[PDB]
Amino acid sequence: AGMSLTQVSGPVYVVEDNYYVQENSMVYFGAKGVTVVGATWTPDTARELHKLIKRVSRKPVLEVINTNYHTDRAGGNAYWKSIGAKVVSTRQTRDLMKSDWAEIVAFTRKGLPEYPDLPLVLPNVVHDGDFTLQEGKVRAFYAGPAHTPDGIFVYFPDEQVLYGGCILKEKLGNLSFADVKAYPQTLERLKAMKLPIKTVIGGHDSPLHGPELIDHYEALIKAAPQS
Numbered sequence: 445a446g447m448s449l450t451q452v453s454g455p456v457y458v459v460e461d462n463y464y465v466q467e468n469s470m471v472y473f474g475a476k477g478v479t480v481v482g483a484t485w486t487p488d489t490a491r492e493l494h495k496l497i498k499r500v501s502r503k504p505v506l507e508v509i510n511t512n513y514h515t516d517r518a519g520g521n522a523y524w525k526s527i528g529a530k531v532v533s534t535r536q537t538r539d540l541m542k543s544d545w546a547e548i549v550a551f552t553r554k555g556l557p558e559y560p561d562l563p564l565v566l567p568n569v570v571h572d573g574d575f576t577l578q579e580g581k582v583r584a585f586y587a588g589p590a591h592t593p594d595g596i597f598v599y600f601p602d603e604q605v606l607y608g609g610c611i612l613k614e615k616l617g618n619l620s621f622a623d624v625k626a627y628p629q630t631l632e633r634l635k636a637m638k639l640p641i642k643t644v645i646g647g648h649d650s651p652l653h654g655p656e657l658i659d660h661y662e663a664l665i666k667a668a669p670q671s
């Protein structure tokens with residue numbers, strides 16, 4: 445299918461969004477409603493994700509997290525706002541989105557001319573620090589710059605699942621916005637937290653991995669240009 449929504453553990457599901465360049469996002473089915481982690485590429489892909497959600501749960505979509513300011517993590521925002529879901533980010537992500545959205549949409553369309561010229565849609569719930577959702581069962585945090593300056597991690601402690609959005613993946617991927625020397629330092633700050641991790645969900649390529657995806661990407665970026 446163009447998009448799939450599949451249980452990884454308990455209430456934690458992975459979205460494989462095969463539109464444009466494959467991106468993987470998360471959904472958490474909680475007691476009061478649904479939390480989406482990663483808005484998906486466009487308002488249309490967001491609507492496609494919502495369709496899949498409605499086949500699983502009648503509970504409201506409460507909030508959607510933009511794990512960075514880029515089009516693959518925030519492009520769906522217009523749709524999520526339109527259904528009354530909160531759009532959530534750090535302040536840093538929101539500030540970078542305000543200043544740089546036009547630039548990232550242009551960059552996206554250079555690679556994907558078919559991609560729409562999306563107007564800016566900013567988060568309406570902005571956090572100054574780390575934050576949690578779903579009674580502490582979805583835990584968002586900043587550990588430094590990597591693929592972008594602002595990208596955050598989201599950890600699901602009950603299921604021992606870590607999502608890093610665009611940070612963790614199988615191939616080097618986009619380095620155009622990356623802090624190549626800081627990237628492994630961020631990955632080491634992450635590992636030093638000693639979070640119990642059974643599963644890492646990569647944000648591109650095939651999603652399902654163990655904790656070693658962190659080490660895999662770390663080794664790749666330490667050999668990359670500008671390392």
Ligand SMILES: CC(C)OP(=O)(OC(C)C)c1ccccc1CS
Nearest residue numbers: 465514515516552555556610617618
């Ligand atoms: C700004 C966007 C999100 O990144 P991107 O230019 O998207 C291309 C146009 C598909 C891109 C390029 C190469 C590898 C991965 C990605 C996604 S992080």
Ligand SMILES: [Zn+2]
Nearest residue numbers: 516610647648
């Ligand atoms: Zn990405």
